[PDB]
Amino acid sequence: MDLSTKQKQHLKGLAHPLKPVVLLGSNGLTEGVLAEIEQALEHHELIKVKIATEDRETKTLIVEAIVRETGACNVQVIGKTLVLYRPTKERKISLPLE
């Protein structure tokens, strides 16, 4: 999911105060962690996923795969924390509309 900068900046601000709800280990993007990311997105829409790897390229590939498989938007990668957003029918999270 691709959102505008405006949209991402808004989401980044709502995210500051959140603590991560999923830790993705150095073993990588397994089906089990993918399923947990799905549940977290369904429950909160905007979440923080801590990614264990220290290797930039690897972190990148993992993030790209999460985006493609889940349809969520990569709001921003901050250090080891990936901020992801995907709406649910309930629309829990706010957003500027374009």
Q: What is the enclosing helix (H) or strand (E) of 49? A: strand 46-51
> What is the DSSP secondary structure assignment for residue 93, as one 8-state letter?
S
Phi, then psi, of 93 in degrees rounded to 5: -95, 140
Q: After what residues is the chain interrupted, C–N > 2.5 A?
A: none
Q: Solved how? A: X-ray
Give CA–CA dist 55/69, Å, rounded.
21
- Written as one letter, the residue type at 80 is K
Range of the domain at 47: 1-98
Residue 37's CATH number: 3.30.110.60
| Cβ neighbours of residue 6 closer than 8 Å, sequence gap 6 or more | 96, 98
**Total structural domains within the chain:** 1
Q: Is 79 left (phi over 0), alpha (psi -120 to 50) or beta?
A: left
In this structure, what token pair is assigned to residue 67?
Answer: 């985006």
Q: Which residues contact 27 (CB under 8 A, 6 or more apart)?
A: none
